[PDB]
DNA sequence: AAGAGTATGGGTG
DNA sequence: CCCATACTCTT
DNA sequence: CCAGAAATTGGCACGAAAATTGCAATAAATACAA
DNA sequence: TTGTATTTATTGCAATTTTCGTGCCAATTTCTGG
């Protein structure tokens, strides 16, 4: 279902296969639309935690004042309105994988709240006096440059070394030129099957056009372009005229 | 004369038509017995 | 139809019809097998590294002290699961050859008869396609409805039939046992529920053969499938060897 | 136990089909046709459906027509008719030509049957070019025919309902009680509940305590439900007491608020309790919600239940002159002489609810 | 203002006390019997008077 | 609805109702054979839906025919005799007919 | 350690 | 009443 | 006999009243520990 | 002597929908004088 034809992507696949026995947290970095989610789910699938939960969490959608309650849970009577005990996402993802998406959007006052949990795995619930120990593997994804954010001062240096034991960098689509045509054919077949059209390839000029456009949205932009071309097709082959949005 | 359901009808039709000949079949009580024995967990079946 | 039993149940025909096929196959007294099946005593399935044989009967206190002494070195069970495990773990060929050697060497009269009986049973099992553990029921067949119809009476009352009553009792016991096993109830209740399910299945198959018989409102025992099959009022003697016919009359 | 086989209309029809010199194709067509016959004796599908169900394209519609014509002469005569006109014409075709009014009846059935359905007797008489006497004889001959020939072989038994409340008259007083043959009840397993002791494991103790408390709560809930139902039924019977002595036309109008105030509850509880509950009385079996009705004002400051007015309308219609039926203006006047102040439109609505045709469709030649 | 916070406060809270055991009134005898059968299945300590 | 004992059965002829009185019960002293009607009774079969064909049937042949069906008591086949006694039992609270 | 005798349970009518 | 099997006394 | 006139019927409307359904967890009496 | 944890005792309020009676009027049926 996934296309890995560029040599860099095959090297990344070899790296993923070599760390299938590890439990250290992983840090995935790149541009937008390069496939960080794909790589994260592939890392989860090939490891020993294949059947274990995969909790994907967007850390930017958690309100500031209830961050601790969401992450760690609370006990009964902790505050006004706490009518029953409730667990957090670290207990929910216990024994499995926790995937923190867009870790670079977290604020400096919220990054300090998960410094001991990532390394030790032990924490206290809100209002609880017993220490809870969990076994969670942490994958983190970011589209920023953390190694530069820490130098600037907008990212805590204490969290980068806790998260970045293993670092993966996914190159942009404009450098994986051996993947543009296979991905185009894959998306074309998928969307032709979905919309019941009768297009079954590209012309010798459309392929040349697809290899020169500097894809800035990467694979997501390529997918959108292919879907739009399939929706408005008129024959059996896609010509350069249809792909006029490129250039 | 007793429990061949299709045989009864065929025999009656033949008698009305003036053709005194029967086409015997399987009695229904034997099928009931087979079902009852199967309901006891025993595999009993007709062969060939 | 079929019913998925929550726990395995033994077939009363292969336990109570003398000689007992289960007992003759496992070489055990009928009393001990009955104690194990109806949750009265334990039985060792795997002896382990201790001084416990593969078919020793353990009481409640004996099993408790065995657990307190040895721990997880062995395995003991009660009910139809233990009997099924014993039946599934036996090898027919090794038993056949060992007993043939013992018969060839030893000379006696009663023991020779016992060995001949066991050899005949084992060779009959091997020659046929059957398996011993098939004598423990896991799925229960259900008769077609038109062979067990409901009785319509004046006033709209439908009453009930013995077969339908037995099926309803079995279904109720099975559903309660499933619910109790799902909620992880204490063992003291689930053992009683399993015993009652075994009794209900026995009543459905052959009512009255094992101990007491379940009766109706007028203190009459309910008719089971065996009652439908056998006897002077059964299928063979009432419907197959003789029957009522058309084109007949009678007079003085 | 076992019952006995019964012969239905379709069994008799197939028995006659078996002993009829059909071909294999004709026999299959006859089987489909008999399958498409209801218990009143009428064909329920068009012949196109039968032709499609046969399953081959070598057969035309006229063969189906011939087989249907052959079948329609089975016993009873008129079975498997397409519509009422077809059944009447088939029944008439079996009569001898010496019948006095056969020709006029045949003409009326073949051509003018909707006019007879509208009870015209004016346009029908004009078109048929005939006098009243011969027209009346033809109508009487038509009405002697069988409209439902398939009911000769009748099968089935009526369905019943078990009452929840019994109302009787003991020592001259109307008494109300619950039906002991259907009152739900539960119990507590003493054998299981006798092991609720701290000697055993604490998990067993908490399990058994929770289950015992839930069981006791459920038993209390059932007991309260039964008591509430009995109280509501007793209040309802006490309020509507002239009905149980003199039947309808003596119903009093009442709503849920009256019973709610009488028993000191909320009308929501009264509404929920009386839902799908039945009461057995010497007059019959009635749903508990049958005793609540609207009302129309009565001269003198009183009120009249709509049930009583409907019963009065039915009784007044049932005892009229067949030649000159009562309209709604006449029924309104015959009700005003008794003090009932009801409108013409309401009387029309009441008559429609009783499934009674208007006045112009009830008149008779006689 | 409008916000979501965890805090310790002193408040006067309202009192809901109904919907308990109210659905049994509108059930007919047959549906009530089915509910009782389900409750018997789910509760070990509940039994029904038997005729056998 | 309740079953009604009546002399007005819509699906039987006038000759077959000749031995019944005004209450639908046979006279004392009548000679009867197999198939004759002793007590005339009808069973409700009404429905709240009226199809156009049902409306046509009710308009042409009357509403009584479409509401009830015959459930009368008939002499069993192979039985004959003379009516010598008739008894009527009525539940307390139900109105009595002429015969009672 | 086997072998003959007695008590118990199943089946039939 | 008659037969098969488990338990008990004896050579 | 005919055509105008009068009577009948039921569909739609409108305001009001009655019936139905969603809500889901508390309050008080009682027995026991300092 | 009291303060607190436990066990019975709680079967209504408030929207929302549905049903009620009765008027307006067009289409339809029936009646009557020249
Ligand atoms: N090798 C590939 N084969 C097929 N589809 C791919 C591949 N790489 C990426 N895609 C597609 O590209 C799209 C965008 O990928 P993805 O969601 O991983 O990007 P992202 O912006 O890095 O992720 P996120 O922001 O969700 O963490 C998806 O629809 C995915 O299916």
TrEMBL record, chain A:
ADP 1 binds at residues 2-3, 33-38, 220, 223. It comes from Aquifex aeolicus (strain VF5). ADP 2 binds at residues 3, 33-38, 220. ADP 5 binds at residues 32-33, 36-37, 220. Residues 2-231 form the Sigma-54 factor interaction domain. ATP binds at residues 3, 32-38, 143, 162, 220, 223. GO terms for molecular function: ATP binding; cis-regulatory region sequence-specific DNA binding; DNA-binding transcription activator activity; identical protein binding; metal ion binding. GO terms for cellular component: cytoplasm; protein-DNA complex. This is Transcriptional regulator (NtrC family). Its main location: cytoplasm. GO terms for biological process: phosphorelay signal transduction system; positive regulation of DNA-templated transcription. Keywords: Activator, ATP-binding, Cytoplasm, DNA-binding, Metal-binding, Nucleotide-binding, Phosphoprotein, Transcription, Transcription regulation, Two-component regulatory system. The lineage of its organism: Bacteria, Pseudomonadati, Aquificota, Aquificia, Aquificales. The chain holds residues 138 to 384 of 439 of the full protein. Disulfide bonds join 21-24. Mg(2+) 3 binds at residues 101-102. ADP 4 binds at residues 3, 33, 35-38, 220. ADP 3 binds at residues 3, 33, 35-38, 220. It comes from the Bacteria. Mg(2+) 2 binds at residues 37, 101. It is found in: Cytoplasm.
């Amino acid at each position: 279902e996934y296309v890995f034809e560029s040599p860099k992507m095959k090297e990344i696949l070899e790296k993923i296969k070599k760390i299938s026995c590890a439990e250290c947290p992983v840090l995935i970095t790149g541009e937008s639309g390069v496939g960080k989610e794909v790589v994260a789910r592939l890392i989860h699938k090939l490891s020993d935690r294949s059947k274990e939960p995969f909790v994907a969490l967007n850390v930017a959608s958690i309100p500031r004042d209830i961050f601790e309650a969401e992450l760690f849970g609370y006990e009964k009577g902790a505050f006004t309105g706490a009518v029953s005990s409730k667990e957090g996402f670290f207990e929910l993802a216990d024994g499995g994988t926790l995937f923190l998406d867009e870790i670079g959007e977290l604020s400096l006052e919220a990054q300090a709240k998960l410094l001991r949990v990532i390394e030790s795995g032990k924490f206290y619930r809100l209002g609880g006096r017993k220490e809870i120990e969990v076994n969670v593997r942490i994958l983190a994804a970011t589209n920023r440059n953390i190694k530069e954010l820490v130098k600037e001062g907008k990212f805590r240096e204490d969290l980068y070394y806790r998260l970045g034991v293993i670092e993966i960098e996914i190159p942009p689509l404009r450098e994986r030129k051996e993947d543009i045509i296979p991905l185009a054919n894959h998306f074309l077949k998928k969307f032709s099957r979905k919309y019941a059209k009768e297009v079954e390839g590209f012309t010798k000029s459309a392929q040349e056009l697809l290899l020169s456009y500097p894809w800035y949205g990467n694979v997501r932009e390529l997918k959108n372009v292919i879907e739009r071309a399939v929706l408005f097709s008129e024959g059996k082959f896609i010509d350069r005229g249809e792909l006029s949005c490129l250039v | 004369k007793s429990d061949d359901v299709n045989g009864r009808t065929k025999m009656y039709k033949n008698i009305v038509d003036g053709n005194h000949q029967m086409e015997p079949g399987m009695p229904e009580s034997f099928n009931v017995l087979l079902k009852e024995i199967r309901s006891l967990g025993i595999n009993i079946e007709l062969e060939d | 139809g079929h019913i998925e039993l929550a726990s395995p149940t033994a077939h009363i025909w292969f336990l109570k019809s003398l000689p007992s096929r289960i007992g003759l196959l496992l070489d055990m007294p009928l009393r001990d097998i009955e104690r194990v099946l109806y949750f009265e005593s334990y039985v060792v399935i795997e002896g382990g590294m201790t001084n416990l044989e593969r078919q020793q009967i353990l009481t409640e206190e004996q099993y408790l002290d065995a657990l307190e002494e040895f721990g997880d070195e062995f395995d003991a069970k009660m009910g139809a699961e233990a009997i099924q495990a014993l039946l599934k773990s036996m090898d027919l060929e090794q038993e056949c050859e060992q007993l043939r050697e013992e018969l060839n060497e030893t000379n006696s009269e009663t023991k020779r008869k016992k060995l001949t009986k066991r050899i005949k049973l084992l060779e009959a099992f091997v020659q046929s396609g059957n398996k011993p553990e098939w004598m423990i029921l896991t799925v229960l067949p259900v008769l077609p409805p038109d062979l067990r119809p409901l009785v319509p009476l004046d006033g709209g009352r439908f009453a009930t039939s013995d077969l339908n009553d037995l099926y309803r009792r079995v279904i109720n016991r099975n559903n309660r046992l499933k619910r109790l096993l799902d909620l992880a109830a204490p063992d003291i209740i689930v053992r009683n529920e399993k015993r009652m399910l075994q009794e209900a299945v026995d009543a459905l198959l052959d009512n009255g053969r094992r101990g007491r018989a379940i009766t109706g409102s007028n203190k009459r025992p309910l008719k089971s499938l065996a009652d439908m099959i056998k006897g002077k009022q059964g299928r063979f003697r009432q419907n197959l060897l003789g029957k009522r016919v058309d084109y007949s009359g009678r007079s003085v | 136990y076992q019952g006995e086989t019964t012969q239905t209309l379709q069994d008799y029809l197939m028995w006659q089909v078996e002993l009829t010199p059909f071909s294999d194709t004709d026999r299959a067509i006859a089987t489909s046709i008999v399958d498409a016959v209801d218990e009143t004796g009428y064909l329920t599908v068009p012949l196109e459906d039968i032709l499609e169900s046969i399953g081959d394209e070598e057969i035309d519609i006229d063969e189906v027509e011939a087989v249907l014509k052959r079948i329609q002469r089975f016993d009873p005569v008129g079975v498997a008719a397409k519509d009422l006109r077809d059944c009447l014409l088939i029944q008439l075709s079996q009569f001898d030509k010496t019948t006095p009014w056969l020709e006029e009846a045949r003409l009326i059935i073949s051509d003018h049957l909707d006019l007879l359905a509208n009870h015209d007797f004016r346009t029908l008489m004009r078109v048929t070019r005939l006098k009243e006497d011969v027209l009346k004889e033809a109508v009487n001959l038509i009405q002697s025919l069988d409209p439902r020939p398939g009911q000769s072989i009748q099968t089935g038994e009526p369905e019943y309902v078990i009452p929840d409340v019994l109302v009787r008259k003991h020592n001259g007083h109307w008494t109300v009680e619950l039906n002991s043959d259907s009152i739900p009840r539960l119990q507590i397993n003493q054998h299981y509940a006798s092991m609720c002791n701290n000697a055993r494991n604490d998990g067993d103790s908490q399990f058994i305590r929770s289950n015992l408390q839930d069981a006791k709560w459920l038993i209390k809930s059932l007991e309260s439900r039964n008591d509430t139902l009995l109280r509501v039924s007793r209040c309802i019977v006490e309020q509507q007491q002239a009905f149980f002595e003199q039947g309808e036309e003596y119903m009093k109008p009442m709503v849920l608020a009256d019973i709610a105030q009488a028993v000191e509850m909320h009308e929501s509880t009264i509404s929920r309790v009386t839902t799908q509950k039945y009461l057995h009385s010497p007059r019959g079996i009635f749903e508990l919600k049958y005793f609540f009705s609207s009302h129309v004002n009565t001269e003198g400051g009183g009120e009249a239940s709509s049930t009583a007015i409907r019963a009065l309308v039915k009784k007044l219609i049932a005892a009229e002159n067949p030649a000159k039926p009562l309209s709604d203006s006449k029924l309104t006047s015959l009700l005003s002489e008794q003090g009932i102040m009801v409108a013409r439109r309401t009387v029309a609505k009441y008559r429609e609810s009783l499934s009674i045709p208007p006045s112009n469709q009830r008149k008779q030649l006689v | 203002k409008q916000g979501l916070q965890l805090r310790l406060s002193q408040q006067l809270a309202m009192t809901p006390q109904l919907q308990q055991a109210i659905r049994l009134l509108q059930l007919s005898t047959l549906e009530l019997q089915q509910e009782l059968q389900q409750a018997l299945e789910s509760n070990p300590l509940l039994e029904q008077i038997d005729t056998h | 609805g309740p079953e009604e004992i009546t002399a007005d059965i819509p699906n039987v002829g006038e000759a077959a109702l000749s031995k019944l009185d005004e209450s639908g019960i046979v006279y004392i002293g009548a000679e009867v054979t197999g198939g004759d009607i002793l007590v005339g009774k009808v069973t409700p079969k009404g429905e709240t839906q009226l199809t156009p064909e049902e409306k046509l049937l009710r308009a042409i042949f009357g509403e009584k025919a479409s509401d009830v069906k015959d459930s009368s008591l008939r002499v069993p086949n192979g039985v004959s005799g003379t009516v010598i006694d008739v008894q009527v039992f009525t539940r307390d609270g139900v109105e009595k007919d002429k015969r009672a």
